[PDB]
């Protein structure tokens, strides 16, 4: 159906089929158990994301790799039961379309990850060079395949030359694993989100330390995020001010799960509604919060 | 009386193949991942009919996106669905199956959704005319003891040449599906149950289980690699080897494969020892390959 012209939100990124299993104890090998409970979610940090923007209220898109079968079945049902724009979707002829699995130990809170497999190709920028892009006010990448995902920017900065400052594309990253091909990305986008995982990698022990020490490599204008999960999250923009918001920890806390996705997404809907830095900063803190008080994201507005 | 009938499970396993078992605690990659429809009744299922022999398949399921993928796998392989017990509430069980690459060792975490088992009282509408073989896995034993008795009482009725043959697994370490043991012409018990009574051998466990049997029934106990062995009313053990692959890739099934083969070939007119021959045969074959496909 038609979209409004700069009307959405694109979440770039990978899309997961998690398949989470709560058990008594972690299995022996060769074995067969019965789990207490088994739960099948659609993850993906792009993926969560639109989940969450869908839920405040946002017209959004997902972009990402998917293979034809059974696992996509349930994780397009998923997108559209979360009201998420399907339509940009990579469609792949060879590589499995990607599933992880989770043992969570009940007696410990140990979790057994069985990470998805590799053969699904990333999206390229050949495929992106196929998107129109007037429909979309805000394009967040999830750093994946750095090399592509720059020509995928640089297509954005081309388009923004030749618009007015109101039909101007905003744009967001995330630099969530530490993989040294991701740190190119830094210099791209308007907003950069660093994750305490990739600060901690770098050496960096606090959001303040690692907003100071990476300010360097983004560019002009450019505001960089970083969250530390219930120590909240910092924020430094052009004006070199560090801002800070506390955490807003729930009364008990439930489930965890894409809280930081929660509040990428939270963080970028604020941005683009015209609320300061500062404001959205606090209200990505408010929503990740509330987030880990809930299973899974029914109820977080 | 063309019909090779299978009650019990079906689950939708949710297969990774990894290079190594995982430590608890860790994330690993995996090499692939594939859907593969399961349960032992259901992979008996799937072996009979790649074996060329008209089968249906008798299990409880509630509709969902689930059932869908089964019904649709089973509906592939020309299985029988028409008496599938569809439920009101509930999963139709899903499974995480961990297969290590590097020897074929699986590993399964079951979710059984709760869903209501098939009753007796699902078993009495069911047409038995046009079954020669019901097999039957053990689960709701007082239950399923009610559905033995009803083909007894069929058979009753028939002469010997019409009478359906029967065969019960009694496969999980549950003391109520010990009663399971005195029905059926063809008994198969598993390794796990005999390790748990205190037997160390396929030859102990079925010395020791024979008393429990009906009279003239065939106990049979396969050993995973160390083959089967099959006791009858003769008093003689039958052993047969198991038939390894030089590379063991894929396990799981492999039990219901030789379960399935030994319906098969006794169904055929073959021998008690040619039966658990081409059991481990099948099985074996089954072993060194992802799947099904490609047993025969
Ligand atoms: C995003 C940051 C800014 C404030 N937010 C916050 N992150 C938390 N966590 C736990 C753990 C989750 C795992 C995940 O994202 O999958 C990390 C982030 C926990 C909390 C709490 F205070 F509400 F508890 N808040
Ligand atoms: C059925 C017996 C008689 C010969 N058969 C045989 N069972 C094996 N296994 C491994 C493990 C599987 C797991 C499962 O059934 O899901 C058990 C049985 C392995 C082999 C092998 F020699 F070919 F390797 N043969």
């Known amino acids: 159906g038609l979209v409004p012209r700069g009307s959405q939100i694109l979440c770039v990124g990978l899309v997961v089929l998690d398949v989470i299993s709560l058990v008594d104890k972690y299995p022996k090998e060769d074995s067969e158990i019965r789990?207490?409970?088994q739960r099948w979610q659609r993850g993906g940090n792009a993926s969560n994301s639109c989940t969450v923007l869908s839920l405040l209220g946002a017209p959004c898109?997902?972009?990402?790799?998917?293979?034809?079968?059974?696992?996509?079945?349930?994780?397009?049902?998923?997108?559209?039961?979360?009201?998420?724009?399907?339509?940009?979707?990579?469609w792949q002829s060879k590589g499995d379309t990607p599933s992880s699995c989770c043992i969570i130990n009940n007696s410990n809170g140990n979790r057994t990850i069985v990470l998805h497999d590799t053969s699904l190709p990333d999206v390229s920028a050949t495929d992106f060079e196929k998107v129109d892009l007037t429909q979309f006010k805000w394009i967040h990448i999830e750093g994946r395949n750095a090399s592509e995902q720059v020509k995928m920017l640089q297509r954005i900065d081309a388009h923004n030359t030749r618009q007015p400052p109101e039909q101007k594309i905003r744009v967001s990253v995330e630099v969530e694993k530490p993989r040294?091909?991701?740190?190119?990305?830094?210099?791209y986008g308007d907003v950069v989100f660093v994750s305490?995982?990739?600060?901690?990698?770098?050496?960096?022990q606090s959001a303040e330390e690692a907003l100071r020490g990476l300010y360097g490599?983004?560019?002009?204008?450019?505001?960089?995020?970083?969250?530390?999960?219930?120590?909240?999250?910092?924020?430094?923009?052009?004006?070199?001010?560090?801002?800070?918001?506390?955490?807003?920890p729930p009364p008990?806390?439930?489930?965890?799960?894409?809280?930081?996705?929660?509040?990428?997404?939270?963080?970028i809907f604020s941005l683009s509604q015209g609320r300061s830095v500062q404001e959205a900063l606090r209200f990505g803190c408010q929503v990740a919060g509330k987030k880990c008080g809930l299973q899974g994201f029914d109820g977080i507005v």
């Open 61 to 90: 898109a997902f972009m990402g790799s998917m293979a034809p079968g059974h696992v996509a079945d349930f994780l397009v049902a998923d997108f559209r039961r979360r009201g998420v724009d399907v339509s940009q979707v990579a």
């Open 35 to 37: 789990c207490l409970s």
């Open 252 to 267: 008990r806390v439930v489930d965890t799960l894409g809280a930081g996705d929660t509040f990428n997404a939270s963080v």
């Open 180 to 187: 040294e091909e991701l740190f190119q990305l830094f210099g």
């Open 217 to 248: 490599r983004v560019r002009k204008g450019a505001v960089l995020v970083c969250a530390w999960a219930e120590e909240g999250a910092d924020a430094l923009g052009p004006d070199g001010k560090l801002l800070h918001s506390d955490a807003f």
């Open 196 to 204: 305490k995982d990739v600060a901690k990698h770098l050496g960096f």
